[PDB]
Amino acid sequence: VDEVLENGLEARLKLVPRLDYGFRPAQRLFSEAEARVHEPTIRRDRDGFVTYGGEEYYEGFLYKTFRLQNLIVNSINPTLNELSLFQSN
Amino acid sequence: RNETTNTEEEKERLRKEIQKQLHEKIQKEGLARFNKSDAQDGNENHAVFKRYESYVRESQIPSKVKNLRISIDPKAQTIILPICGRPVPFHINSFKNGSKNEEGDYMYIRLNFNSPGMGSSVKKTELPYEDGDDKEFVRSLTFRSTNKERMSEVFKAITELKKTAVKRDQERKTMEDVVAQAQLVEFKGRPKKLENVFVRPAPDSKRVTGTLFIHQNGIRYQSPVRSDHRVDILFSNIKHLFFQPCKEELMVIIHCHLKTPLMIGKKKTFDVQFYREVSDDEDELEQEQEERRRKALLDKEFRRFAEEISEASNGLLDLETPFRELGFTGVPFRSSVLCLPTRDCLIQLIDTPFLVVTLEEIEVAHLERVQFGLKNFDLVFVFKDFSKPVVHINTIPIEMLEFVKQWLTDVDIPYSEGAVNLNWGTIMKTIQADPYEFFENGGWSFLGGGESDDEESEEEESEFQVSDE
Amino acid sequence: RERACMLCGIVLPGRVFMQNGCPNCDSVLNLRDSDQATVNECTSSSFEGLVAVGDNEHSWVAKWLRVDRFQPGLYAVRVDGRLPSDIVAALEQYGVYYRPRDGSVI
Amino acid sequence: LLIRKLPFQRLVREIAQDFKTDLRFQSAAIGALQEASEAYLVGLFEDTNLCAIHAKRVTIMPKDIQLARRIRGER
Amino acid sequence: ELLIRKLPFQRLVREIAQDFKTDLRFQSAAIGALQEASEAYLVGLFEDTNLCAIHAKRVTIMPKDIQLARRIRGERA
Amino acid sequence: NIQGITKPAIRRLARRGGVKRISGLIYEETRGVLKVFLENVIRDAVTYTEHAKRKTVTAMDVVYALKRQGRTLYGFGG
DNA sequence: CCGTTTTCGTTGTTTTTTTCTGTCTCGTGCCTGGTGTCTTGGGTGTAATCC
DNA sequence: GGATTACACCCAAGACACCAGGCACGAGACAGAAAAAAACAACGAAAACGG
Ligand SMILES: [Zn+2]
């Protein structure tokens, strides 16, 4: 939970992107080189903050707002693999 | 201030003295360029008729003609018309326009043909018929038929044949004055290249990014989507090479102005532009700083590439950059644009159509609309080649008048001022008819008439600087 | 569309809060004289427990909700979101103590 | 002055004939009226030329005059 | 209702005023009057700009439209 | 403090003025125009204040400064 | 308000020639047609709360 | 059992805009008719000055 919206109905979250760059693809850090090779229409707004296909990826991690009705805030079961993938940066 | 206005006005007397020495110089260099022997050898110019033919032999006429009806031969661009049992051919070139009217059971189609007297929009240079005061012309033929559907199809096919003929003639003209250029010699090693570049005019209706390559005797633009959309430009054919960085623009530019026009796709052009675009409270201020970084990056890369083009030319091409601080706003075409001086040219490259005026090719500048408290003025450039049409720059703000006059003086261009928009279509045709007689009677030096020649004034009151009562 | 003014607890449409401001909190919030960000920071559309009060003076509920000194109308038992630190300091400048109605403070 | 001095005098008298019958005029009244009228019209033609150039044109048309008088605040 | 936020306009006014005399005070009614006048002026200017844009046979207002309107009004020389 | 006049505010002012589509440079152009207007008006107001030998700018100074420009304002004590 | 001076406004006549016009052809710019691609709607479809 | 509904997304249309073609109404050109303009002289209303 990178950001909590003051409204409390939604919140901006840090996620691992699920893209194929052109039934869901496995989660993987957004790779700018592969994204440009498969889709040269990448946008840039800041250093380390990249917007590709309308989705904002910050230093390889997706940052997208999600509804409160889209989250489980209790009985959360973590895995080392995801923990390492999140804490490596 | 009085001693500075005296100093500034003495520099303005030097400005006027230079302008007078420029008018006298051009008058002497017009009398030396045109001799009385050239006036005696006056060349009369005559309308050129493009000769065409429908058929040479009666065998060439198709056997389909046997029907006593209107038969069209697209291969020979011919409309065979049944005139009293005669298979009379009429070439699509002789044909002008057609009108179809279904009156009752018969379809009355009147096919009009080219006839002198405010006829076709084609210029006098090329006439669709041979010049002849004693020549009589078939102006129109009206036919009727009981079969409405076929007669409608025949009319469509005549109209299509005319459209195809006009399109082919435009395509030819867009390739005509274009001089047959030498073939670009590819560089045998790894060529220097600039990627993700857009070209203007575009070779296809679709805007596609390409790569620009430097070769031994020119540059090549090459689209990644189609190999056939290559644009080759020889160094020998480039007249001027401009670079323009993003000082206020959303775009970076490398512009090639050409000596001879090239046929890019369907368009004849003297100008070929290569460009790329940057476009895609502290956070918004930082986003402007990130755009300023992206500007500086593309500026550095495209400037370097334009210098590398200049180096590859072996000193045939100088790299020019616009002096933005000397720029003024005006309307050369249909939009208000910033006109930018360079070393050797007056340019506008941001919007199409492009303006490129070479300063050395100017004979005289005329400032139109200049008079008592006027809001704006127009600037007219006359060229040394009187066959070249004059260039108008309209609505230059009156605040820029004294700056433009100074700039024209600093470039050794004579100028004149007038309250009225003088017609140049008239002025030029008279000057083209006899250039020698023009200079004999004072050329533009007499027209200038800088001398105020005003002594009438408005009288004066009893001159008495003494206190009264 | 309705929002609950965080300070007094009244509930009114957000456009009403923007156009006219809070009839009770305008002496300390200036909600009408405040931009949309301040309106959101003092009026929240996410709330719970609609309350209608008829007589502030004698209603024990109004005293329990500390709204017995305000205009009768629509009020919310719980309001999502709290006043910002700068607005809290501004109110403390005026000498008025702010008690959150978010329920997390009791 | 581009307009003449006698047609303009007659126009001024004709217009003045509505507000009070048989009114005399003075040495520098008609001259001042003509100067003001020509200055006003020249300014209006300046604004009209600006609008016509704005429309990418060179010919001034009555709608440019109307736009100029609208922006000036003229009724 | 006023379409500009009050604090930004107050900060802008104080920033501008600080270039003529330091330690100046403004009654709140002075800022309110300034905001009313500025918005009324800007709305009239935008109406003239819209008229110019429609005259040019367009829908999008452009900086050249603003400059032309201000020139015709007699505000820019 | 001139960045406080955000793009949405200029959009709102253009919508109340009836403008249907807006270029991207309109915002900077409008900021410049507003700055010029405010500069003139505040300069006149501060002149009035200094003459009145005050350190506070009243509503009367603003009203007289607008009357000076020809922008007469009603409802502020005029 | 009343008497004075004398400028320049009103009155009329003759002559000049620049401006208005009848007439023609050409062209350039007004208007119709073909096309771009963006902002947005209406809909399917997957998925769901509620009682 | 039943139903209306949230929500993401696809297939598609309305709109302001860009580019091209062509036909006619305007500018340019020339020879002719018109009356605005220029120049002249006469008369005196009324403007500028005074007590
Ligand atoms: Zn409240």
Automatic annotation (TrEMBL), chain A:
Name the source's superkingdom. Answer: Eukaryota
> So where does this one cross the membrane?
none
Where in the cell does this protein reside? Nucleus
For this chain, the family text in UniProt reads:
Belongs to the SPT5 family.
Free-text function comment from the UniProt entry: The SPT4-SPT5 complex mediates both activation and inhibition of transcription elongation, and plays a role in pre-mRNA processing. This complex seems to be important for the stability of the RNA polymerase II elongation machinery on the chromatin template but not for the inherent ability of this machinery to translocate down the gene.
- Protein name listed in UniProt: Transcription elongation factor SPT5
Annotated source species: Komagataella phaffii (strain GS115 / ATCC 20864) (Yeast)
Counting on the full-length protein, the chain here runs from 340 to 453 of 908
TrEMBL record, chain B:
| The FACT complex subunit SPT16 middle domain, residue ranges | 70-221
Q: Which ranges carry the Histone chaperone RTT106/FACT complex subunit SPT16-like middle domain?
A: 328-418
Q: Where in the cell is it found?
A: Nucleus; Chromosome
Query: Signal peptide span per the entry?
Result: none
Q: Which family does it belong to?
A: Belongs to the peptidase M24 family. SPT16 subfamily.
**Subunit (UniProt):** Component of the FACT complex.
Job description of the protein: Component of the FACT complex, a general chromatin factor that acts to reorganize nucleosomes. The FACT complex is involved in multiple processes that require DNA as a template such as mRNA elongation, DNA replication and DNA repair. During transcription elongation the FACT complex acts as a histone chaperone that both destabilizes and restores nucleosomal structure.
User: What's the protein name?
Assistant: FACT complex subunit
Species this protein is from: Komagataella phaffii (strain GS115 / ATCC 20864) (Yeast)
Q: What is the lineage of its organism?
A: Eukaryota, Fungi, Dikarya, Ascomycota, Saccharomycotina
Q: Which residues of the full protein are shown?
A: 478 to 962 of 1005
From TrEMBL, chain C:
Q: SUPFAM superfamilies from the xrefs?
A: RNA polymerase subunits
Origin superkingdom? Eukaryota
Q: Where does this polypeptide localize?
A: Chromosome, Centromere; Nucleus
List UniProt keywords, sorted A-Z: Centromere, Metal-binding, Nucleus, Transcription, Zinc
User: GO molecular function terms here?
Assistant: protein-containing complex binding; rDNA binding; RNA polymerase II complex binding; single-stranded RNA binding; zinc ion binding
Q: Which InterPro entries match?
A: RPABC4/Spt4, Spt4, Spt4/RpoE2_Znf, Spt4_sf
Which biological processes are named by the entry's GO terms?
A: 7-methylguanosine mRNA capping; heterochromatin formation; intracellular mRNA localization; negative regulation of autophagy; negative regulation of transcription elongation by RNA polymerase I; positive regulation of transcription elongation by RNA polymerase I; positive regulation of transcription elongation by RNA polymerase II; regulation of rRNA processing
Q: Which Gene3D superfamilies match?
A: 3.30.40.210
Give the family, as the similarity comment puts it: Belongs to the SPT4 family.
* Annotated function: The SPT4-SPT5 complex mediates both activation and inhibition of transcription elongation, and plays a role in pre-mRNA processing. This complex seems to be important for the stability of the RNA polymerase II elongation machinery on the chromatin template but not for the inherent ability of this machinery to translocate down the gene.
Q: What is this protein called?
A: Transcription elongation factor SPT4
Q: Which organism is it from?
A: Komagataella phaffii (strain GS115 / ATCC 20864) (Yeast)
